[PDB]
Structure formats: C-alpha cells, structure tokens
Amino acid sequence: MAGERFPADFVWGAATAAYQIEGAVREDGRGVSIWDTFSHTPGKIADGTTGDVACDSYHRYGEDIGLLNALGMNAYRFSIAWPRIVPLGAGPINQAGLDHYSRMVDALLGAGLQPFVTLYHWDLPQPLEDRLGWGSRATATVFAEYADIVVRQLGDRVTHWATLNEPWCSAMLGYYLGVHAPGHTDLKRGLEASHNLLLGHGLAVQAMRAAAPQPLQIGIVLNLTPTYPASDSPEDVAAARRFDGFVNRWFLDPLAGRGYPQDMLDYYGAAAPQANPEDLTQIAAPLDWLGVNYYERMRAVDAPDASLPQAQRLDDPDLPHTADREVYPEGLYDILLRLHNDYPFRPLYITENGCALHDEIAEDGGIHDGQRQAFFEAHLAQLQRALAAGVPLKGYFAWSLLDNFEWAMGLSMRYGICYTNFETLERRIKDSGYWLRDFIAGQ
Numbered sequence: 492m493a494g495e496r497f498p499a500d501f502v503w504g505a506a507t508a509a510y511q512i513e514g515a516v517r518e519d520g521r522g523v524s525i526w527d528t529f530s531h532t533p534g535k536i537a538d539g540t541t542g543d544v545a546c547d548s549y550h551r552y553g554e555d556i557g558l559l560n561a562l563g564m565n566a567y568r569f570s571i572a573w574p575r576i577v578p579l580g581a582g583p584i585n586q587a588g589l590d591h592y593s594r595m596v597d598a599l600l601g602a603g604l605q606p607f608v609t610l611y612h613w614d615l616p617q618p619l620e621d622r623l624g625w626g627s628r629a630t631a632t633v634f635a636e637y638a639d640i641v642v643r644q645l646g647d648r649v650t651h652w653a654t655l656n657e658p659w660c661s662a663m664l665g666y667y668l669g670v671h672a673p674g675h676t677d678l679k680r681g682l683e684a685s686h687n688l689l690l691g692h693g694l695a696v697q698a699m700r701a702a703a704p705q706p707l708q709i710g711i712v713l714n715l716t717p718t719y720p721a722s723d724s725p726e727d728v729a730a731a732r733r734f735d736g737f738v739n740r741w742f743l744d745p746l747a748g749r750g751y752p753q754d755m756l757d758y759y760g761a762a763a764p765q766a767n768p769e770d771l772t773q774i775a776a777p778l779d780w781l782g783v784n785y786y787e788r789m790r791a792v793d794a795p796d797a798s799l800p801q802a803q804r805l806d807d808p809d810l811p812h813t814a815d816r817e818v819y820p821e822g823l824y825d826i827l828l829r830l831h832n833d834y835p836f837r838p839l840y841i842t843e844n845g846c847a848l849h850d851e852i853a854e855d856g857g858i859h860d861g862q863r864q865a866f867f868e869a870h871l872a873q874l875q876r877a878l879a880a881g882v883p884l885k886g887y888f889a890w891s892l893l894d895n896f897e898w899a900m901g902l903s904m905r906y907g908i909c910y911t912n913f914e915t916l917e918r919r920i921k922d923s924g925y926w927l928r929d930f931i932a933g934q
C-alpha cells in the first residue's frame with residue numbers, strides 16, 4: 492500500500508442527514524419542518540415521495556450502526572433534527588428529542604463510532620419560516636439557542652460539531668432558485684438568507700463554547716465547487732470568477748474574516764444584504780475545523796442572458812457521468828490546495844463525497860456499483876496527493892451510508908454505499924461499501 496496509507500488516527504465515516512433518513516415525522520413531539528411542508532406540496536419532489544418514512548432510521552438507527560460497524564468505520568456524520576429538539580423553532584425544548592439522540596450517541600460511542608454531529612441540515616422549523624425563516628435575523632438568534640440546548644445535553648460526549656451544512660444550498664436553492672425548501676424564488680431573499688445563516692453560525696459557535704461542559708471542536712460544512720473557465724477569454728474567465736464568488740467565496744471570505752468579496756457585493760448591488768461590521772465580526776467566530784463537501788467542478792462559459800451569476804456549465808462528454816453529475820476527481824485536489832494555501836481553516840475534513848447511480852440488486856444479490864468504487868478510489872487518490880502537499884486533512888466521510896430521500900429528487904436518486912429497499916426497509920451493503928471496508932482495514 493505504498494503511498495495509500497492514511498494516518499492511523501484518520502477519521503473514516505459515512506454521512507447522513509435527519510430528514511433524509513429518519514422518518515417518524517409526527518412521532519415523539521417532532522414539529523413540522525420546511526421540508527415536511529415542501530415534500531407535501533404537489534410537484535416539489537420528482538417522484539411523489541416524502542420523508543415521512545424514508546429509511547425509518549428514527550426507529551432503525553441500530554441497523555445503521557450495524558452497517559457502520561460492518562464497514563469498519565470509526566465515525567458517523569449525522570444531523571440532529573431541530574424540529575425534534577425545539578418543535579416550534581423558538582419555543583420550549585422537547586426532551587424526548589434530546590433523549591433519543593443521547594441514546595443514539597451512547598450507542599455509537601459504545602460501538603467505537605465517533606459522532607460528528609451536524610446541527611442544521613436544512614430542516615428549519617416551519618413556524619420560523621412563517622416568520623420569514625432565514626429571511627429574518629431572529630432565526631439566527633434562535634438557531635444559536637437551539638445549538639446551546641443541544642450541546643448542553645450532548646457535549647460531554649460529542650466533541651466534534653458542525654453548525655450548518657451547505658448554507659449556499661439553504662440560501663440559494665431554498666430562497667433564490669426555489670428548488671429546495673422553503674421554495675422561494677428571489678435573489679435578494681436568498682442573499683439575505685445567506686447572511687442570516689452566516690450570522691446564525693457565528694452566534695451559535697459562541698453559544699456552544701459557553702454552553703459546553705468541555706472544549707469542543709466546532710466547524711462548519713461548505714459545499715465547494717472548483718470552477719474553471721472554458722477558455723482564457725476575458726468573458727469566460729470573468730464568468731468563472733462570478734460563479735466561484737457565488738458558491739465559494741461568498742461564504743469562505745466572511746468566514747475567514749475578509750468580509751464579503753467586493754466583486755460580488757458590487758455585482759449584486761441592490762440585492763446584497765446590509766452587512767454591518769458587528770455581524771461580520773460574529774460571522775468570523777474562530778473555528779476548529781472546516782468541512783468540505785465535494786462532488787463536482789464547474790467548467791464555466793459566459794452566459795449574459797442567464798440569471799445571476801451569468802455562467803453556464805460546459806458539458807464534457809469525455810468525462811464520465813453518474814446518474815446526476817459529471818465526475819472530476821482532480822477538482823478535490825485543486826480545492827484542497829486552494830484552501831491549504833489561500834485560506835486559514837485547518838484541519839480539514841471531507842464531510843461528504845459520493846455519487847448517485849442507477850443501483851440495482853443483481854441476480855446474485857449484490858449491488859455491483861463499480862463506478863461508485865472507482866469514484867471513491869479516485870477521490871481517495873487525490874486526497875493522498877493533497878496530504879502529500881501538506882494539506883492538514885483529518886478524515887473522510889462517504890455520502891451516504893445508505894440510499895435515502897434525496898431532497899427534490901425523492902427516493903429515486905440513490906447515493907448510498909448501502910442499498911435501501913424502501914418498501915421493506917432492508918439495507919444491503921453495495922460492492923463499493925465492501926471495497927471501503929477492505930481498504931480501511933488494509934489501512
């Protein structure tokens with residue numbers, strides 16, 4: 492395994508999110524989230540499905556633990572559902588929710604699985620959305636409150652915490668492009684949501700450190716899409732830069748204490764939120780790690796007629812595609828080298844990486860997902876290149892542990908290393924899962 496070995500203390504996991512797996516949407520005091528409302532809105536989800544049952548992991552998380560162990564993982568990245576903890580968003584605690592996750596943490600730790608807890612993976616309580624949701628500063632305050640409550644109960648056992656998952660998605664897909672909950676379609680509302688998300692992050696970090704019974708390792712998780720111009724023309728380079736600012740720098744820079752990127756501010760003009768010095772200070776609260784969710788690159792062509800940021804993807808039919816994305820492993824090297832050299836966050840974790848395929852159970856009973864195996868091998872090779880470059884990477888989480896409710900695509904789009912039969916709830920490990928098992932064991 493020359494050149495293939497990762498650090499002996501490397502974190503090896505798989506990842507999930509509460510609304511995608513849990514089900515039990517009305518049980519044990521759970522409130523209504525924006526994704527309950529959105530999934531039950533006609534035509535918002537591709538295939539008529541909802542998260543009402545999903546993988547039934549509310550009841551079945553011991554099965555999930557069994558899979559993690561069968562895989563020889565040493566960690567599990569999962570989210571806590573705010574609707575189970577503070578059903579009204581701003582309001583009383585629901586102790587049955589806290590006690591469920593407490594039991595789940597003890598089960599994980601008992602099994603030798605470090606919990607990597609995401610506080611916010613998109614399931615905003617609907618009552619908050621009724622009051623503008625991420626469009627309101629008050630939501631930031633009450634998000635920090637929620638962070639406080641959870642860390643008070645679980646922070647004697649869970650050291651590693653992420654405040655938000657992918658605030659670009661929450662803001663832009665949820666408030667600008669309308670493809671995620673709550674489903675609004677206004678640029679200024681998306682940018683305002685981005686700010687309040689960032690603010691909430693920063694407020695929560697401070698709240699968590701105060702509320703914690705021991706020192707924590709607190710991070711945030713960002714989707715990053717390395718962007719490349721399709722030519723070196725001024726037009727295509729500028730288009731690459733705008734897309735890069737839209738997705739990456741818009742979040743990285745304020746987190747890094749650099750304020751919002753001025754190119755973007757000027758570009759958005761009227762639509763840009765008002766960002767006082769005080770909020771930017773709070774947004775840059777010191778972090779102990781950064782999580783990177785990596786799936787794809789953007790090869791950008793100028794598109795003056797399109798919506799902001801006026802940049803279209805140029806498809807490359809020479810690169811392989813999965814069920815829903817282009818495969819470009821080298822982009823993971825590039826993005827990590829950029830973070831290592833250009834930004835201050837360290838250590839880094841790959842909090843998600845994975846792919847969707849048209850997975851089926853074969854005649855023999857296995858799932859022969861060689862493309863997903865190759866996806867992991869190629870990305871893990873790039874991570875070995877990045878580590879050889881000095882990048883302080885401390886773990887890797889495959890998205891996902893098991894096939895699940897894939898947001899607007901529903902149960903139809905399978906990302907698991909384990910196959911989920913949605914009718915019987917049986918899980919079965921796919922070939923890529925066995926590969927990860929044996930790679931991790933070998934070391």
Ligand SMILES: OC[C@H]1O[C@@H](O)[C@H](O)[C@@H](O)[C@@H]1O
Pocket residue numbers: 530531532533534536538539540541
């Ligand atoms: O119409 C939106 C959704 O409403 C839900 O109550 C149904 O269970 C789904 O099958 C349907 O897609």
Ligand SMILES: OC[C@H]1O[C@@H](O)[C@H](O)[C@@H](O)[C@@H]1O
Pocket residue numbers: 519549550551590591594
């Ligand atoms: O005890 C109420 C609930 O608590 C959860 O933690 C368990 O996973 C469920 O099976 C049970 O219904």
Ligand SMILES: OC[C@H]1O[C@@H](O)[C@H](O)[C@@H](O)[C@@H]1O
Pocket residue numbers: 508511656657660714784843890897906
């Ligand atoms: O689309 C695959 C995955 O992409 C990421 O943006 C999200 O964090 C996951 O919840 C989603 O399932």
Ligand SMILES: OC[C@H]1O[C@H](O)[C@H](O)[C@@H](O)[C@@H]1O
Pocket residue numbers: 814848849850851902903904905
């Ligand atoms: O048939 C294999 C798979 O094909 C496609 O991805 C379908 O969307 C999915 O529902 C099915 O499980």
Ligand code: NA
Pocket residue numbers: 811812813
């Ligand atoms: Na393909």
